[PDB]
Design a protein around this ligand. Sequence first.
Ligand SMILES: Nc1nc2c(ncn2[C@@H]2O[C@H](COP(=O)(O)OP(=O)(O)OP(=O)(O)O)[C@@H](O)[C@H]2O)c(=O)[nH]1
Ligand SMILES: Nc1nc2c(ncn2[C@@H]2O[C@H](COP(=O)(O)OP(=O)(O)O)[C@@H](O)[C@H]2O)c(=O)[nH]1
Ligand SMILES: [Mg+2]
Lengths: 436, 426
Amino acid sequence: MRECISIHVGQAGVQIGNACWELYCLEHGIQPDGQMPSDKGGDDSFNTFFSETGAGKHVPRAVFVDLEPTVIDEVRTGTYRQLFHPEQLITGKEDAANNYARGHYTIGKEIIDLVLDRIRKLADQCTGLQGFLVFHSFGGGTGSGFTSLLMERLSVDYGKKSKLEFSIYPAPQVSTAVVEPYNSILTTHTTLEHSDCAFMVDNEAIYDICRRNLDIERPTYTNLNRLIGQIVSSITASLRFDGALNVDLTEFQTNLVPYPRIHFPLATYAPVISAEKAYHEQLSVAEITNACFEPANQMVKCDPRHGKYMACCLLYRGDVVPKDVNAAIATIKTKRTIQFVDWCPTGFKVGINYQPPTVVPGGDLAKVQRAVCMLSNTTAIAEAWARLDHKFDLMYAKRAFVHWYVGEGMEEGEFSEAREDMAALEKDYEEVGVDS
Amino acid sequence: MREIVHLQAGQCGNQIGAKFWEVISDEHGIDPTGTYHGDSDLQLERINVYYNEATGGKYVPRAVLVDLEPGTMDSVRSGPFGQIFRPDNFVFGQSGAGNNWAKGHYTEGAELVDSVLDVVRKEAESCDCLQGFQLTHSLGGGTGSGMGTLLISKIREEYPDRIMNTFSVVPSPKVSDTVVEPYNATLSVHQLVENTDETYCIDNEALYDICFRTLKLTTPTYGDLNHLVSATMSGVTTCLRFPGQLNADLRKLAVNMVPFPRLHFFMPGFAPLTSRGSQQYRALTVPELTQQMFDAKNMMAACDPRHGRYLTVAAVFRGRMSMKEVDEQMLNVQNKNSSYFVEWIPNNVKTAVCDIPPRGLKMSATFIGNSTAIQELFKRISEQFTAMFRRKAFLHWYTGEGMDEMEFTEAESNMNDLVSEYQQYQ
Ligand SMILES: Nc1nc2c(ncn2[C@@H]2O[C@H](COP(=O)(O)OP(=O)(O)OP(=O)(O)O)[C@@H](O)[C@H]2O)c(=O)[nH]1
Ligand SMILES: Nc1nc2c(ncn2[C@@H]2O[C@H](COP(=O)(O)OP(=O)(O)O)[C@@H](O)[C@H]2O)c(=O)[nH]1
Ligand SMILES: [Mg+2]
């Protein structure tokens, strides 16, 4: 009944996919063959992410899309090669090459009808589709440009359905490409107009948590992507397990987005800890909530003390009881460091779910009795954009790469157009924070 | 899916190209017979990039070998791997160019073009999705300089949208190999600026410096120098042919490297390089790898970065390493050395990490630098050209081939604009 469709775009999307679907298989007891041995029926919990074949083989409701065959071919060949349906792993021949115009205007149009055709088949299998979960990077040509095209098309075919959007935003300082500002700014329109709720994370924040909370000196993408998977598991837990106070995706959106234009929450997850440190701490309900409001534990390099909270969604898992959630929230409301906007006097949505977190073998996290995932809509996010407008204005003042984009069938008026869209959005975020 | 066609022009082109095919056959595990003996199933997954398949499990290079006189190619065929090349891909004249760019460009080489273009069509049209073309040559010569630029100008009309890369040896700052060297080099650069997407400026006199100062070799032969160049050549393509955590093909690099369409001359480098004795004193780490990669002594070009500003940089790391440590190191170098990077590009370095190091080595990197210091190369050539041309010292060898003297003044003006184009960003 309550299905979700996952869409994994580009190298970042595909490689996050590997971490997500490893987790979901283990969380439901599905082997990498797709067999469940515990069917000695009456378990529906898998049905959000998997569909059952009459042979007893469970097939992900996923689509993986890339304009290059290198990242997908590993999936076609590794441990999970039997899990995915062969036609869900769509691939092209040549990457957008970090150029948004290739992903959007020239290369993307070659493969888009295959992706849209496959999404029909998955949506027809559903009977109560909650929405689409999209994973991509801002900085890439395929993640930026092809996703831009894809969500504009999905908006026409499925205008009612929620599109949620997890994305890798560029870090403040570390970077991997030089054209990273142009793609990011040009992306903004589709996150502004075609996404119902967008969660941004940047890699420089997550490198920080893996160093001071997991004691890992040299984390790779495999460590980061495992943290992202735990967030998505928690948002969808109330679709999959029993709980005292289950939150649906529709109900989740109603309590975070106060205006249609203002839909950019920060994600945070707690506790993140090594098992060597979990030995010296009690992970009580109060303790884990305080850790969600620390600036050092945010997944974007922005400081919430420089802005105002509009609304917060707290999702708790495991050995948690309402008596202590009430005690924890009451404490937070007393701290003058944490300032809510005056026009939002009841700033919390709470969810409690009985199933505790699973842990992947050989992963970094501890086995824990309980956890909390927090989603928070805050005026402090506007500083992350201003810090990236600067890089765009700096380069663009002298056309530094524009011939690459205009030669691929863009026209240069989009550069100022997109930069003005970002200006308008930043001006809205600063004024909605003003007290009445 | 991303096939490369390899071109070899002239004496230096063939001697380098022969070494390149030995180097990458060792990575893929191809015997001199042309048959596969590699241990890893990952070695054949992308072998299509450089080789065609043949019946019986034999692989042949997608290479075409060109010379105006066969003498050098006979030495190539007498070598150990010289049997792997398809015999129909040797294209040879019967009269040398004489180090005269006009002979190679208008008189001798113009009669040979059609034979080469038939081989290029037949190789290129076999590809499922051609990535582009790759030429090895020298600018100081007659066949490399003259006909190499003729070929480039023709195939870029037949295939405008494909990538065009030149690995080109350029004349060195203080000992010439050829008396007429600066005419050939000046006329040839005038062809490159119009018709190439990337150019890598190798200089033989920098390679002697690396062999002496870093490798401590007492008797380096051109077999050693051509090995260094081939390691650079294979490093740039590795992400097309092995899996990695951040893939990066030729086009992705060019997009991130060339801000304006003329500014496409790059300085290569390779790391690690160590002598036999020092091997025991190293500490194999990404930092130590990064330190040598930016060292001015390690550049394969006779231009010094300290005299200019980097526009853009690429590092293609090979080996299983932590992404955080790489991202950390490339930020750290930019923050300290703020004077050596242009102000108006916020991040100058492109990174790409592959999983498979070369055999017998833990980690490796290939460096590409686009630097305003490259004007130093063209400006010292420009002065020598002017010193000769005002006295018309050797023009009768070129005008007797029907060349027009206006074409010499044109090449000055185009090369002098190019040095001005770089200067404005110093
Ligand atoms: N967190 C995380 N970021 C990743 C991962 N892989 C790539 N990235 C980020 O993605 C960006 C690079 O662009 P890609 O996502 O690789 O690009 P793409 O969507 O494949 O498109 P093309 O560049 O056209 O090939 C950088 O910000 C990387 O740090 C990953 O596994 N995890
Ligand atoms: N690095 C390197 N340089 C070479 C090699 N062979 C020749 N050269 C240089 O390239 C130039 C000679 O090229 P040349 O023989 O004239 O090419 P041609 O046009 O075919 O005649 C000189 O500067 C030589 O020093 C080689 O094997 N390696
Ligand atoms: Mg990619």
